[PDB]
């Protein structure tokens, strides 16, 4: 039921539908072999698709929309811009964005218009949508326009009043509107179908196009070795790891927040805590992507020295503080971590299992966060620390898998799409 299927092949985009649409990718479009493409604000950043009665039809694609600039928030909220336009004789459809809102507009032959949209929150401590790959699907039948986000129905618009909408027009991928120079958009897997896709089908496609042998970072891009990452905890979203002053352990602190006074904006800072870096058991090499079940060392930088995250071999309680220390071999600690992804649903979270070596059947425990007793004349009697725990060994077997377990981590690199 596919009538257009844009995919990457050899530094270009082509139609694989077999209906042979002509695709002109202009020099302003950045492409990669992960099928991601980038529309920027410069004039040559566009794609023209020339394709060879009331018709049901559906569009799906992935999109990654960058965070607002804090100092440019008014126009982000105010200014709508088209990113994909498909019109003939002033009739057709368009996909637009006005700030934190993505919009689907239908235009009949008479110019009569209807829209359906999805809006995400820009006051969330930590957002699931901002500058993160998510999945979009819009369906149209005789009576309704629907938007699905990540397989789930989000909005519905009655389009009974509309009239014949012309669909054969050329499709223009280009940012069009009163935008800032720094504005851009990433897209992936653009598709069009000659039927209204059912919620069941969208969900299956969501899961299938979510599949990868590799792991992903917090933004949704492939997880990499030898790349600097801040760490996020899905069970403790506002917390972060810092090497404790004068002690070789990771204390856990609360993220700082947006500290100015725009009334449209709130978020927690993401670029804080230690800069971690994932290495290889053996060991630095070109574009090495991290895969499920890989064996790694979890390292980080401490004043131009590379330190590593250890566990004591012989910890006595159900959980214990991790040891953060220089790279060294020791009879007393494990350093071998196996990176895991226990969730069976789409996710960017992973788990970090300590192990004896690469051949062992023994599971020592999973890295997470726990509260420990503070001795002496202190403020608080308990404090959060960067830990290993045997308890998660039990909890990761429960089904369905818990998205919010404190043994679920994501890795956050600096990214042009998030500034704070």
């Amino acid at each position: 039921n596919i009538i257009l299927n844009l995919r990457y092949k050899d530094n270009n985009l082509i139609d694989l539908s077999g209906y042979g649409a002509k695709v002109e990718v202009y020099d302003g479009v950045e492409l990669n072999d992960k099928n991601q493409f980038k529309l920027t604000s410069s004039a040559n950043s566009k794609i023209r698709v020339t394709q060879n009665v009331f018709l049901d039809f559906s569009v799906s694609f992935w999109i990654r929309i960058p965070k607002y600039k804090n100092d440019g928030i008014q126009n982000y909220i105010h200014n709508e811009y088209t990113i994909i336009n498909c019109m003939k004789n002033n009739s057709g459809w368009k996909i637009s964005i006005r700030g934190n809102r993505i919009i689907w507009t239908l235009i009949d032959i008479n110019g009569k218009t209807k829209s359906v949209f999805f809006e995400y929150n820009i006051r969330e401590d930590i957002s699931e949508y901002i500058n993160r790959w998510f999945f979009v699907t819009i369906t149209n039948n005789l009576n309704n326009a629907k938007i699905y986000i990540n397989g789930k129905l989000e909005s519905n618009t009655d389009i009974k009043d509309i009239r014949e909408v012309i669909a054969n027009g050329e499709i223009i991928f280009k940012l069009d509107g009163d935008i800032d120079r720094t504005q851009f958009i990433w897209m992936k897997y653009f598709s069009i179908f000659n039927t209204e896709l059912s919620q069941s089908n969208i969900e299956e496609r969501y899961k299938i196009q979510s599949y990868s042998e590799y792991l992903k970072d917090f933004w949704g891009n492939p997880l990499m070795y030898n790349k600097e990452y801040y760490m996020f905890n899905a069970g403790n979203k506002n917390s972060y790891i810092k090497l404790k002053k004068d002690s070789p352990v990771g204390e856990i602190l609360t993220r700082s927040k947006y500290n100015q006074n725009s009334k449209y904006i709130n978020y927690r800072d993401l670029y804080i805590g230690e800069k971690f870096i994932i290495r290889r058991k053996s060991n630095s090499i070109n574009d090495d992507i991290v895969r499920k079940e890989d064996y790694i060392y979890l390292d980080f930088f401490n004043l131009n020295q590379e330190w590593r995250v250890y566990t004591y071999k012989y910890f006595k309680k159900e959980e214990e503080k991790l040891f953060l220390a220089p790279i060294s071999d020791s009879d007393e600690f494990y350093n071998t971590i196996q990176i895991k992804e226990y969730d069976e649903q789409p996710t960017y979270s992973c788990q970090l299992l300590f192990k004896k070596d690469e051949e062992s059947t023994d599971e020592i425990g999973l890295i997470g966060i726990h509260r420990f007793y503070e001795s002496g004349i202190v403020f608080e009697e308990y404090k959060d620390y960067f830990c290993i725990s045997k308890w998660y060994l039990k909890e990761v077997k429960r089904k369905p898998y818990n998205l919010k377990l404190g043994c679920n981590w994501q890795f956050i690199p600096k990214d042009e799409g998030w500034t704070e």
Binding site: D246, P248, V249, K321, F323, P326, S328, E332, S375
Partner: protein, 39 residues
């Protein structure tokens, strides 16, 4: 590093393991004990 070890064990409330790590370095159980009372 050996000193980071000892500091680690005090931080996890394992004062004996700390003495074990220092003596392994290896230190005098008197100097070692002072080091500990100091941290």
């Amino acid at each position: 590093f050996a000193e980071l070890k000892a500091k680690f064990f005090l931080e996890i409330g394992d004062r004996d393991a700390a003495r074990n790590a220092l003596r392994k370095a290896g230190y005098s159980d008197e100097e070692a004990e002072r080091i500990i009372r100091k941290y």
